[PDB]
């Protein structure tokens, strides 16, 4: 459910590696494992909000999850186990009926035919399962699943046909692209391409189309008025991709030569994202003084009448300075409001991407301003993002208006949250502004963790609030408060469930959470003499399990906020852990320090609950391992652990030639 909610566009190999990890940590039978995959997928589909998220969830269950199962089959008698899991699932009639009411069709039929196509299931199994499902079921628009399952081959074939610009026929390109701009067709193609790993090539194709249509050639009005529309369609769909599926699918990741495209630089330096706030007087927003006067004269001329040669990248880069001079003119008073209306109509009318570039600079500039100084510039957005200017539209105007209104919603939302301002473009932002306005943020955390424990699984909305709290209060505060809420449980059942949930919650940034957990929380609980009454057997065994699962999963080795924040972070782990493979990698340093602490606790006097804790930690280090986290164990632990009470030697030693000597010493002298 986490991989469905946060990164649909992630590669399947990382997910297969993580799932095989989880299957090896807690020893999970294969039918129950695949059953939990299908149950999670269907529950997340039912709980999805209506709109793009529902399309994305249908793609994840229908396309990505069947591919993941195929990779598991190669890595691992899988057909018998997946057939068993399908019978396990087909007992759950209320889940499947809720799903069928949301799917508007029987979605289990499409699942069984899809798993038949991938080869997870034999055909006789498929047919008797569909017979059972029809018997249990007995008691004009195509649904989204058929659209997606047929739209993935259109993704491949649209790649292969628009490699060549429809044999350089821009009228054909425009018609097919307008059909894509029609309702929901773009979203269907993007959801299929995201779930099937082909969003990068799709973005490369539209970016290359954009580079081709940037300059243009000697042309009369009719050919150019097609070329500017191609620029608009490619630009608006690229902005919609970058706002929905993240910006890192737009990046080229290696550009040999300086010829980075226009849209990549514009998105890099000029488009607001979630964690990106922009400098309005960055040198990117001040290209020249020469072209910008030509452009303000161009906007004050009339209907451009000169779209026959515009070099649209230069125009779009220059609009920021242009509206800056317009704003200074209006702040002095030398321009009337009625001429402002004329300039905004000349911007937003013929080409809609100009409005997006202007609104991006306006959002940066309004974010920098004070409270009382804002009032004029917001009116500019009200005219740039207003309803349609009419009677000179090129073609496909209403659909570009719809996509543009979505992009401007997601650009302006933060600034229009700072001051209570309604622009009212007409849900498209279903998980946005989730925290209560005044409540301290630990109450939010404890309430959501209480509800996740009492349900037994993590919702999608709960995943989004947990992400915002991890970004807001930081890793240490987050991990410490969740572990406190663990340690005040008193039942065996609730402690084991809380740990099995907290591992997945910590999979937001597993690596940093393990550094905080094994470096700050656990040494503070083991070293403080007042604290270790909290380390009693009910919560203590569960906590030791969570620490060893975190250590193993971090050793063997994910969201965009977490990528940005770890790139922000500066710390000296050599100075933090002085320590009396690389050993400049911080996780090796934390593990070496923790095992020194464990040996020191086992060797000392005053046995208490903390000694029981380090016993349990070493025992699940032994049991959870296949064979290595225990490569960092000091060899004195081999002697001491059976002083404090076989296999806990023979696994922990890692079997070097000197390691046999310590092994044979301990095992013979038990």
């Amino acid at each position: 459910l986490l991989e469905g909610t946060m990164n649909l566009t992630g590669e399947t190999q990382s997910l297969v590696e993580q799932l095989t990890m989880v299957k090896r940590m807690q020893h999970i039978p294969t039918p129950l494992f695949v059953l939990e995959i299908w149950k999670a997928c269907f529950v997340g589909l039912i709980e999805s909000p209506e709109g793009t998220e529902e399309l994305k969830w249908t793609a994840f269950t229908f396309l990505k999850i069947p591919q993941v199962l195929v990779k598991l089959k190669k890595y691992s008698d899988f057909t018998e186990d997946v057939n068993c899991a399908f019978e396990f699932l087909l007992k759950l009639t209320p889940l499947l009926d809720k799903a069928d009411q949301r799917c508007n069709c029987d979605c289990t039929n499409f699942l069984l035919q899809e798993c038949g196509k991938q080869g997870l299931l034999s055909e006789a199994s498929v047919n008797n399962l569909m017979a059972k499902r029809k018997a249990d079921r007995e008691h004009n628009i195509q649904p989204n699943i058929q659209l997606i399952l047929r739209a993935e081959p259109t993704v491949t074939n649209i790649l292969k046909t628009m490699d060549a610009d429809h044999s350089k026929s821009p009228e054909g390109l425009l018609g097919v692209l307008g059909h894509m701009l029609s309702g929901k067709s773009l979203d269907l193609l993007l959801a299929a391409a995201a779930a099937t790993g082909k969003l990068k090539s799709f973005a490369r194709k539209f970016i290359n189309l954009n580079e081709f249509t940037t300059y243009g050639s000697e042309e009369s009005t009719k050919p150019a008025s097609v070329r500017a529309l191609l620029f608009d369609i490619s630009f608006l769909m690229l902005c919609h991709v970058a706002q929905t599926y993240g910006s890192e699918v737009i990046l080229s990741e290696s550009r040999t030569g300086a010829e980075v495209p226009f849209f990549e630089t514009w998105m890099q330096t000029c488009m607001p994202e979630e964690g990106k706030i922009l400098n309005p007087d960055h040198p990117c927003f001040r290209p020249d003084s020469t072209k910008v006067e030509s452009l303000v004269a161009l906007l004050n001329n009339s209907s451009e009448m000169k779209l026959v040669q515009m070099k649209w990248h230069e125009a779009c880069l220059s609009i920021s300075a242009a509206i800056l001079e317009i704003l200074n003119a209006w702040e002095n008073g030398v321009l009337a409001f009625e001429s402002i209306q004329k300039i905004t109509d000349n911007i937003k009318g013929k080409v809609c991407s100009l409005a997006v570039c202007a609104v991006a600079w306006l959002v940066a500039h309004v974010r920098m301003l004070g409270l009382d100084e804002r009032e004029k510039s917001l009116q500019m957005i009200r005219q740039l993002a207003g309803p349609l200017f009419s009677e000179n539209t090129l073609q496909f105007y209403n659909e570009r208006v719809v996509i543009m209104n979505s992009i401007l919603e997601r650009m302006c939302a933060d600034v229009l949250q700072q001051t209570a301002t309604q622009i009212k473009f007409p849900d498209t932002m279903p998980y946005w502004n989730l925290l209560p306005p005044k409540r301290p943020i630990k109450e939010v955390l404890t309430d959501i963790f209480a509800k996740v424990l009492e349900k037994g699984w993590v919702d999608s909305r709960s995943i989004h609030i947990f992400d915002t709290l991890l970004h807001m209060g930081g890793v240490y505060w987050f991990c410490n408060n969740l572990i406190k809420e663990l340690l005040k449980e008193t039942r065996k059942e609730h402690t084991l469930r809380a740990v099995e949930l907290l591992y997945s919650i910590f999979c937001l940034d597993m690596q940093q959470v393990t550094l905080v957990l094994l470096g700050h929380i656990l040494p503070g609980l083991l070293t403080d003499s007042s604290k270790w009454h909290s380390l009693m057997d009910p919560p203590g065994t569960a906590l030791a399990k969570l620490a060893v699962w975190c250590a193993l999963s971090s050793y063997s080795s994910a969201s965009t906020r977490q990528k940005k924040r770890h790139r922000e972070d500066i710390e000296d782990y050599i100075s933090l852990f002085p320590l009396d493979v690389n050993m400049r990698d911080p996780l090796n340093r934390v593990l070496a320090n923790l095992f020194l602490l464990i040996s020191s606790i086992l060797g000392s006097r005053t046995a208490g609950p903390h000694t029981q804790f380090v016993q349990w930690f070493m025992e699940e280090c032994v049991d959870c391992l296949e064979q290595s986290v225990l490569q960092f164990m000091p060899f004195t632990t081999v002697s001491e652990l059976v002083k404090v009470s076989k296999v806990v030697l023979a696994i922990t030693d890692l079997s070097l030639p000197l390691g046999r000597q310590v092994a044979a010493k301990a095992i013979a002298a038990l």
Binding site: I277, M368, L369, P437, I441, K442, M472, G524, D528, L597
Partner: protein, 766 residues
Amino acid sequence: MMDLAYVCEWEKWSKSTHCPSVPLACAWSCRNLIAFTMDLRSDDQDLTRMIHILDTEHPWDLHSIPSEHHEAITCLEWDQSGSRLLSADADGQIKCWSMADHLANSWESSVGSLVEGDPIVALSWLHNGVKLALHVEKSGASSFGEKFSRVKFSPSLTLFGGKPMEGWIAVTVSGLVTVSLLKPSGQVLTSTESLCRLRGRVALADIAFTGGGNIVVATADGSSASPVQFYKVCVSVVSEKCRIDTEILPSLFMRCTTDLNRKDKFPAITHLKFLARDMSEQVLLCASSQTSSIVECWSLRKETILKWRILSATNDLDRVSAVALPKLPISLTNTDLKVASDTQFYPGLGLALAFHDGSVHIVHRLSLQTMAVFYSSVHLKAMQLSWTSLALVGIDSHGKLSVLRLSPSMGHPLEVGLALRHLLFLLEYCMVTGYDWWDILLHVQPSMVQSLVEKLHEEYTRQTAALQQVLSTRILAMKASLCKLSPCTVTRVCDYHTKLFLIAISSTLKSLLRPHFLNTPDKSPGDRLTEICTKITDVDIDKVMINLKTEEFVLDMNTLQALQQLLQWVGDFVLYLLASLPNLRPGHSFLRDGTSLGMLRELMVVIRIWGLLKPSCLPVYTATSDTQDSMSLLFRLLTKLWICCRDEGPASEPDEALVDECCLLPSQLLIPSLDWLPASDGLVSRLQPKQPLRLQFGRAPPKIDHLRRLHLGACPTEECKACTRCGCVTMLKSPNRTTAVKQWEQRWIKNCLCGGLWWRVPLSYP
């Protein structure tokens, strides 16, 4: 320049193992008390939750408040006075520690706020509207109104009068801000409110105040490519409750992100600091990579009307580990910059920047060019300049706590008159305020001491006759503490302290006599007594006592009996002085001071009257004869000494008749012994330039109560307070709560007479 005054280390309690370090707090008060936390980490984590109070003159004695802070202490903050300490940790919980029984060794918090779960990231007391500016170009101007002048600042939240409320404002790691207002009663009002509607991370924050009673709070989320946002907060009280009104101000981005050559380095803003609280228009930022850093200064200045423009920035540094901003409120304008560059006055123009190597840079405020460099020969994890900014304290990446002295001209050699004028200017600033002057005595060389004392007396004169009233005991304390510092002048300090004690007795005895009826009105009976004792120069005590309306000098014969020990000190000091006359000793100054001998005469006369009312109040003298009137004998010799000095323009050397009569005094009476107050354990006399003292904490490299003159035993059973400056000892609780002269005991509840604080001394148990 920089000299390490001392390095105080823990003994064997270092080597924190297996648990990583934490950031430290440090706070230097107006009185010289350092409050700081350290990472001790031995057998408990509460050893990282203890707040150490270190009086800067006796560092070995470190008090350790066991704060009940469940997470790590983020911020420490002294009052505008020095009397309370705010401490806030992660997960809310601001506690307000106050002194217990006015001891600087016992702290206890009754008042606090709590925003649970949210880590406090900035904390400040509210501003009480007092702000003064120092005009260095008027250093010779011979009036304290010209040198230091109040600058018309308004306090946030005035309540029904001119009186500001006291309270704090804290900023959490979420968007939340909270204000707590302490009533004059024990009540406390809290209110929390988000800073802006877009709730977001506040990883660094800072608080300044403005004229107009507006708080200005700056927030950053550490990313260094995101804006440093600014909010104006206005506090109000609506009819029962606090009310917070916030408003966005112009944010700023940061240079080195628009550098465009290599902009990706320095990705973390690590310190955000206004240049001083109440200086809300300038902001110091410090971007840092793993190895290098940049500090920058910005200013709000208007032309978009208000707009943050950069002032200056350093080139490239090491990674800045700590930052200390000055506290001396210089006047900062262009003429004062000129005269402080000409006459090399540099105390208020420095910031200190520690680095991740050993070095420390004292750098200019306005254009951040390095003024001095001190190489440690391990890094400073917390620094704090002093209130006169002559010394900076600093806690290292070990247990070590060091105090460095910064010279006022930053190592450039000055002629002696300029150094005299600088240190005299600072001592006058500490005299007008009540701040402590210990850091100044770090910089006073012995060879200048006497000249400096002369200048103080000349500046004690030529003020406007009410300043001379209010600066009396402050200048006696400063004179004594200066004269401690030189071997030529070390003999006089005892005199100064007895002078304080004499005045402290004299007025109080003249305070006790309530005239039962007003005869010869418009003169209080202190003045009638002084007039009568100065016009009647009769050598007999009876002839003076006759003419003094002795039905007026009446007490209730209970307090009159309880005054016995103070009257005993008066008689014994008179006898010691007169026997000391034939001989540099503890009494040498008093033999030629006509005024003090007049005071001793007046006390002997009122002692005679009170002895006739009740004979048990009198001092006792072991007389080597039984037909003797010892009081009349000492009064005869005192009048004959005092008529020497009560002449106009006299300096009469004492004649031989007095010399032989005072040679006969050990024959007639037994001269007892006396305790002299400054039992000197201060470091400033012990220190030398170019040699740092290396101390251990708690190692510390005929017992009387000096204020109520009670003899404790050999090893005293009742516990005691010691003054931190002079060193006088008093027992902690009064011996007889029924018979206690509260007019005398209640003077020294909060301080000593010299001015320093009390500090509880531990019992021996031999």
